[PDB]
Structures are given as C-alpha cells and as structure tokens.
Symmetry: C3
Subunit: 434 residues, 3 copies
C-alpha cells in the first residue's frame, strides 16, 4: 500500500496540541454570528443529543484549544497570538509523547499575530524550517494540527495561491493557500511540503462553517523564521516604517505618470525619512537593499520584518528618473513634517467671489478657486485646463476655497486622472486630468 | 518536486478573468437569502473588520466578476450568459498578460446560458478542445478560473458523476461533476483533463454557501463546441422541438407496455412533426439520425443542439414494432394537432345518471361515465375490467363525465398502471391497469 | 489514463441503493434546525427554481433513502438500522442491475444500529470482508453509495483518524474517519481499501452542511462481520455487560493509585459479575480473554461484540498485583449488590454537632462528619489528613452528615485528587488527596 503517513509520523513530534488554561479567553471569543447556539454540545460539532455528555470539549471559554510547532531543540514553540493572548498557564499536549507541562511565553506580537514559548522539558524535537518561496502553485503539501477537537490530524493537499495580503487578520499578512481540509484548532499548526519540511503555518480559513471549504491560509515559513528570532532576542517585535502612505502603480496611472514602475506613493507622510531622502508624490518606491517593491503591501510587510533606527539606502523614481537616497526606519510614531504638490504643480490659484458677469444669482455655482496660471508640465495642460479657468469641482465633488481644493488635490495622487469641473468665461467644462 | 503546475501554466493564458462593467447587474442579483448581510465587507468573504478598506471586491452590483475561455485564435471567448446579461462594457483581465480592453459580445443564448465574445486584441489563445464524453468517472481533471475574486487559482481532482440533467440552472443541461474546489467567479471557467485539454465548463456547484463542498458542475465541452459555432454564425442559437411531452420508460411500464424500450412519450403536443411521422402515445422514441435515446433529457438536449426546418428521420417503436419516417424540427411554437389513444383505445364510453336500482340518494357516488364495450387488446382487459361497469375513478381520483374521464385518460401514459374504481352491476371494485 | 474506476465496477454490484418504502419514517424524520424550509425542492439540493418538477426525490417522508452492502452470495445485505426502522416494504435498487424488489429484514439491533436483510433473488453478489484493524493513518481508501439521491457515486481519500467512540450516534461505536466526500444516503454504504475489499461502513458525517465537509465516519468491517453473524443467527443481538462503571486511567490517577495500568473502574455496579469475581473500585481492568482494555469504550464496545451468559476469565489488578477470575456477561438488569470502599479506607467517621468551643452560631460550617480515626494507608495520610479532623466538604462541596459524606466519597473514584475541606481544633485546611 502507498501511504503518506511517513510525514505524519515525525510531523507530530514537532506539531503540538495546546491546552491553554487562561482565566481570560476574551480575544479568542466568538463574535455575534448566528451559529449552533441553543444546542451547544462539544465545541465545533454539529450533531444532536448523543450519550457522551460534557467534558471532552468545553474548556475553550476560560481556557483555549490550539496547535503549535516546536521550532528548535531548545524546546521553543510557535503559535498564533490570538491563541496565546493572556498567557497564564499555557499548558500543552504533544501528540506522539502526551506530555502536559505548562509552557512559558518568551514573547509575542499581535500585529504579525505570532508568539514564541519555551516548553519546560528536554529532548524536544525541532522542525526542518525551509523556504516558503521556492514554492510553485500545484506543489504538494501536508497541513497539520488538531481540527475541532478530533485529536491530532493532517490533510493532504496542493497549493492553490501564492503570497496574498488583502486579508489583514491582524496587521501584517502574506498568506499562501492550499485546498486542504483544516480548521481552527489547527490554529498555529504547520503546513509542510511533500518532503515533510516547514513551508507555512495555519491560523484561519475562508469557509462558511468554520471548517474548510477549499480555502485554507498559511503564513510563510520565512516570515515566521525572522519573526520568531525577533520574539526570542528581545521578547517582542519593534517596527518603524518609511513614514508613508502607498498604493501600487495601476496600468492607467503608469502611462499618465510617465511609465515609471514600482509602488505608487499616495502621500508621503510629511518629514519622515521618505521626505528627507527626497521621495515625493508621483514618485514610486522600487527597492529596499534586500527586498523589491511594486505594491503597498510590499513595504508594509517588509517593514513588518525590519527594526528600529537603521538606515536604508532605498531606490525610488519620479517621472523617468531614479534616485537612491538614505532613509531612517521611521514609523507612524516617528514623523516630523514635509512637502508635496503633483496636480498643484505651479498652480497659481486663489479664492473668489469674482467681479464679472453673468451666470446667475447664487454663490453655490461660483465659489471655488480661480486660476491665475498653469505650468506647461502640469497635467492640467495635458488635458485641456487653461489660465483663467475656475475650479468648482475636483473629482466631480465640489469646493469653496483653496483649502477644499488643496484637500481634493491631496487625493489626486490617488487617481489615475481627475474629473475636474472648470468654469471659464461663461460655461463650465469637464476635463480628464492625467 | 512533482507538481502539475504545467497545466496551470498555459491555461491561465486561455482561461480569462472578467472586468464585466455593465449598468444593470440584475439578472445575477443575489437572491433574498440569510447570508453575511447587514455587515458584508469584501464580497464572498466571511470576515470581521480587517485593515484593508473597500476597493478590491465591491463592483459586482454595477459590474460582474467571472471567468471564461478563449476557444480559437480569433480571440472568441466564451463564458456564462448570466455573467454578461446586459453586456455593455464588458472589459477583461487576462491572467498573465493583464490586457484591459473591452470585448465585443457577438452573441448569447439564455437557454444553455452561454455566450461568444470577441476580445479586441491579438495573439490570443486557442484552447485544445477535446471531447467531454470520452471521459469516464474517476478520470483526473483540473478546475480553472478565478474563485471568489482571489485572482486566477486552480484545483485538481476527479470525476464523480457524468452527463447529467435534473439540475435546471437554465433550460438545457448535461453537466459532468468533480470534487475539485470551485466557486462563483469560476462562472464560465474551464475543466481540463490530466493532459490539459478542455473537457468542461464550470457554471455552478452543489454547496452550502458557495465555497466548494465536493460537488462542482461543468457543462460538457462537446455541447459548448456546437453552441459557440451556432452563436459565431448568426449571433444567437435557434432550437426547435418534436412537439411531444416525454419521459423515461419505468420498470413496470416496460412489462405493461410489452417489453419495448426507449423514451416514453407522455402526451403528444398534437399533430406535430412527431404525430405526422406516426409517433403517438404508447410509443417510445429510440434514436435521432446521430444520437441515441432512452430518456427524455436525451431528446430535449439533442433538440437543444439542433436548429430549425431540417428533416430528422428519427426512429420510434410501439407495442413491439419499430418504424422510421421523418420529422421536421418543430417547436412548441409550431404544431398543428393530433391523435392520442392509450387506456381509451376502442373503448365505448358515455355519460350517466343511471336507470337501474339501487344504491343511494346522492350524485357524488354514481356520476361518472358508463361502459358499453371494452376492447380485448385494452389494458382494462388485462386487469379485471368488464363490460357493464361504470367508471367512477381514474387513479384514486374521481370523475363526473366524459371530460374528466378523457383528461385522466390523457394522464394514464404518465402512469405505469392505473387504479380505476369501477362500479359494477352492484358494487365498486378497484383495479390494476397494466 | 489513470483512474480508479476499476473498483467502482464491482463495488456497485454489492453496494445497494434503497427506496425504503414504509409508512413510518418517524425515526429518520428531520430535527428542528434552520436547514432549508419554507422553500424545499428535491431533498438535499440547495438550488433555486429549476424546470424539473416534484417526482424525483420527495419520497423520504413516506420511505427512506439509503445505502447498503450485499455481504454474501446468499443475498444478505447490511445497512444501518435507522434506514430500515419500521421495515414495511424495503425496496432496493442495486446499481448496474436495477432489480426493484422488496427485501426481507432478517434482523436488527438498534444498539450498534445495524441490520441484516435478505434480498429475494438469485445470483446476488458478495463483498470481500477484510480486516478493519490491519489498518493505519494515511492509507488510501474509497467511500461509496448514494450521495444525496444522485445514483451510485464514489469518492476517494486517506484515513484521518482511527477506531473512535465519543461520536455517540447510537449506543456502541468504534468508527474510523476519512476526508472523502460522503452525504446522508450514503447512510449504510461502504468504505473499501485501495484493493476493493470492505474495511468500513459509513453511517453519518460530522459536517457543517449535511454533505461532507471533511469528516466522515465508518464503523469497522470486523465489527459488522460478527454483528451480522449474530443477526443471521437469530434476528437480534444480545448484549449483557459486566455490571459496572468505567473510565480510562488518568495520568495523576496513575501516580496516586500506585502505578497500575488499565481502564479505571469508577464505581463497580455492585454484586455484578465483577464484585462476585473479586473486582473492586480503584482496581484497573487489563484484559478480556480476547480483547485488551485501557479505556471504558474498550469494555463497553467489547461487550458490544459479546453475548449473554458465558463466563469471561478477565484480568484486573489492584495497586501492584494482578488477579484473573471468572465473570458472567451480566446486563444492567442482572446484578445483585455490592462492595465499595476507597477514600473511606479505614476511615472511622461519625455524625456531629460537636461539643467544644467556639467558632460560630450557625450550623452551616460545622455540620458534617467527625473523624475518630484514619488508617495509615489512606490517601488522606499520603496528603495531610489526620485523626480528630472533621470533614466539612469533599471537593469544594459541603456535607451535612454520613450520607452526604458517602455520596461524595463514592465519587472520589472519579477523581485523581480531592480538595477536601476539613475543620480541626480551631481552623479548616484544604488538602490534596492522592
């Protein structure tokens, strides 16, 4: 007979079930979903009244169930922090040895949502940690933990997606997808490859009944490697940022922003390291000295893997022109004021109640800002806006003064183009600014 | 590592994702269901507030999200018709080249629910369009497209049921069925064999919330291959009929109707191409010039795949002889009228309120139709019916006259046997009319 | 092509579909859930309005729908009891033969919820009954029958859990699990190995949507093998017991109760075949002559595969010493009463309201039981309990007299340690009795 138990024999020696007595399970508390209340038996079941009364799965209310992986022979375990929030007596149960000591939280971060914990025994297994990004889609894998109280279990699968954020279960995310039947209680148990080496970790699943419908998510194993090291070596993680807001370059933005390529600065968050290194609006982020940028979630989760105060000679372009300049890693809590202008670009413009005829007898249609002149480079002249125009609406939405221009012009480096409405000598026309 | 990415590889460049901008998304409007309503975040998620705001999945109410297949190098895409119903500005994402043109809707048919659509670029992919019906159950397949908007993501699995109607997603059906995980947004997307060739087109799934639960359905490629052609040729498909209600031959119906075999005409829609070809009731449809019949979904779907005014020399049998005249392909809209028979054949029956003693003083029990003669070949004569009985009942249901008699004696060829109740020279028997 | 249709050929030849017609479907009536209602179509769909009307799958209100297996060439089929509860006119549709007879129920046992039924024809197949316990996690299998009324469909998978109770669908349980997708109506249908031999029988599935979401459940084929012989033999099965209460030995029980290894008797159910074989409380059950015990679910389900009145020369131990004596298979309804001592072991206690100064005026903290002596072996003197104490409560719970004392000192053999509350000359201590 062919079986792939052969992974399953050793994989349990690393992948723990977790017993988790906590006086406060208030982070891993269910939200007001209309679930199997009114006849709640053993947790995460569905069946009717059956003879085995309470005791088997109950403690999840003033304790928690979960899974973890012992990363090193030092007996340091990893699991998801929602599983280990309020870490009093985080008892474990290792399938393949049945041992039941308290574990000692060494350190956590709720942003990456991850923890490292010393279990107090010796001759504890490590895990062959390998790289989550040698993967292709279609690669075979085994995903592991204790699903919904059955005991320790493993489901055979393939990858069906790579390196996915837009998920934000907490704050920093790069998930990889398998089709494998996995549940909560596999919360912190592993995803290994077909050779039984560590490639990601389970936490959560897109599905309708909490148990799998095709769409299991693992964290990267490379992510947890450096995350665990930072949670060991100071007992937490400490990020800054480049003090920024960011998007990806979109296809129509690209030609409109003169066919440079990288992540779109939306707004540089003033006087942070971005600004001081001379990054601006209409610029694009291209590369960290270790890591390549195209998207907003690239810088976010790369900085979810960098620490305080080190300088970074980051590469960036504007228009057609690259610089590499020197930026301190400066967070949201780290920013001291700065400049940007790129559809207010030599716009000499000012407030009105103008001194000419004739339109009508209401300020509604004539407060805004009047154009003194328009720089040749400004996307306005690309697009047919001229000196002696009057701006009344900016992205269809209307304005009364310079403040409410400069507020909508601070949202333009978030628009491929702008639907301005510009009154002239007599009529208001519609333009398409890029 | 063994990975069947190799299919995945070229199937993205044929199996499209759809930026289906249309202003009336109201033919695929969500049914009034208790889903994740009042607080739905991104469409087709389950989740509580995560850091990423709106801007990734929301457009599906003034657009749609889907998948399709470029069949020939013309760039003739096919997808579901319901994805493109009201087809205004249907623009594309071709996974792996990102080409955001609109496509011309060349034509759509809402009975099969499929449409042919020219994408206005070049070097656009064929697909290797093999037979769905050379498939057996257990054969290995991949399942393709974009599930719930996660982007282009594939699965692989096996066939667990074949060549099926009784699903009624539209008006013409013959789906084949896999375990592999597929959701909404794979709507119109491919099912390819282990070798990478098109054996079917995914349109729906038997699940409990739209994430796959082992039961996904793809239209056979061989039906889409003649659908797409009739829609390339004139922008629509025109289907006929034989003018004939139809069923499968049930098991006692074989032995009652003397051991013929074929699809059971339940009642002829009168004087049609069936009737003028000799097809009556008590008759069984066996074969179209090209296609073999035992059930009514055979004749239905074979007519689905044929167009008007041609003469089909179809074969049928009655009692114990098989005949071969010729039928026009004549619609429900097309049918002159007709002759019927069965359990009234050469019977002589007329109305009553009788002139003999005795019974009772209420008409409920004695109105009906009386029996002058019963033909010897007739089913009544198989089954305990006599001359000088009075029919009161025609299958546990009662009659006041010839009309409600001859109406149930139209429904007797929807029966294996009939429970007539028949008042005799003094008492009401009950009988078994094979 | 590689496909495992090879087993799917001869499996259908024994794995029946059933059209279980009876007037009383009132055991397999739906329970009040928010499953689909007010809008039903065909049973176990989810789908909106389809052009295939009532007639396909209504009947399971006034019939059952299920699966089974023809065991032997004698025509003897095996299925759930709940499928044939009130076996009126149990009609069959064996796939690939269609022989629409009634079957004759030979016998049933609701306890295992298993049947044996004769189908009344000739040349009927068998099934290759192999061992369910030469088995392992991860071996390849197939799961079979009628998944929601479709015909004969088969899925394929790997074993994900072994020999289990705590599922409780009836009264006796030793199920095995695989991921492979099975629905009610596979009720009574099979699980066969990768060579086509019978290893398991699916009854139900711990799903979220009633169709399989990952967690099917097969009673072992070596359990239904002898069950079937006891059902052929006489139409029913006869279960005794050994007239007892049992649990598995907990780890700190192990160490307190002197490091013996078996199933923990919790309370001997008094003058059974246990007590009159010398078996006591705090004695561990090690081996039945044919079946080795470590848990209660052992002895339960071994009784679940054993008949009346035979004498069973069973192994038990006390503290460090093994005995083997003989035990009749005596029911819950078969036991003359009784011998009982454990943390009352030499405890010479009596009722009080006691004649010394001073404490308080309310009886609430001084009614209880006074301790005249404590024998040296008592887990009391292992743990701090002395003579002249006063027991006021036994594991937090307060006692008023000898009767309430002894109710709780009967349940201590359901504990590893007890937190007795014992008043002394002036104060009350809490203790930890092992």
């Amino acid at each position: 007979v062919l079986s792939y138990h052969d992974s399953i024999k050793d994989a349990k020696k690393s992948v723990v079930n977790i017993s988790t007595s906590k006086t406060i399970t208030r982070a891993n508390r269910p939200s007001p979903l209309d679930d199997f209340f009114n006849d709640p038996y053993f947790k995460q079941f569905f069946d009717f009244d059956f003879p085995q009364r309470k005791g088997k799965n109950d403690k999840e209310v003033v304790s928690s169930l979960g899974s973890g992986v012992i990363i090193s022979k030092d007996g340091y375990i990893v699991t998801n922090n929602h599983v280990v929030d309020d870490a009093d007596t985080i008892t474990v149960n290792l399938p393949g040895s049945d041992i039941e000591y308290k574990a000692k939280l060494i350190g956590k971060d709720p942003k990456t949502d991850l923890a490292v914990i010393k279990i107090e025994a010796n001759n504890l297994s490590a895990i062959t940690f390998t790289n989550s990004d040698d993967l292709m889609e279609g690669d075979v894998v085994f995903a592991l933990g204790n699903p919904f109280g059955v005991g320790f279990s493993v489901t055979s699968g393939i990858i069906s997606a790579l390196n996915k954020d837009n998920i934000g279960l907490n704050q920093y995310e790069n998930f990889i997808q398998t089709d494998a039947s996995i549940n909560p209680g596999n919360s912190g148990g592993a995803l290994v490859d077909s050779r039984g080496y560590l490639v990601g970790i389970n936490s959560a699943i897109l599905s309708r009944g909490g148990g799998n419908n095709g769409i299991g998510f693992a964290i990267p194993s490379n992510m947890v490697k450096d995350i665990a090291k930072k949670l060991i070596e100071k007992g937490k993680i400490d990020r800054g940022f480049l003090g920024v807001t960011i998007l990806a370059l979109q296809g129509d933005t690209k030609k409109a922003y003169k066919n440079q390529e990288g992540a779109l600065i939306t707004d540089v968050q003033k006087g942070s390291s971005a600004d001081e290194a001379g990054l601006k609006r209409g610029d694009l982020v291209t590369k960290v000295n270790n890591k390549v940028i195209k998207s907003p979630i690239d810088l976010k989760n790369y900085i979810g893997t960098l620490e305080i105060g080190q300088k970074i000679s980051l590469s960036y372009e504007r228009d057609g022109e690259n610089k590499q300049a020197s930026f301190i890693l400066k967070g949201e809590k780290e920013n001291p004021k700065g400049v940007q202008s790129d559809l207010i670009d030599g716009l000499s413009l000012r407030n009105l109640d103008p001194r000419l005829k004739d339109r009508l007898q209401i300020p509604k249609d004539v407060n805004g800002v009047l154009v003194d002149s328009v720089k040749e480079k400004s996307k306005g002249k690309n697009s047919g806006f001229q000196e002696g125009d009057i701006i009344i609406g900016v992205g269809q939405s209307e304005i009364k003064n310079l403040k409410d221009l400069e507020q909508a012009l601070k949202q333009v480096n978030k628009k491929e183009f702008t639907k301005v409405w510009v009154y002239r000598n007599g009529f208001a026309t519609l333009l398409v600014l890029k």
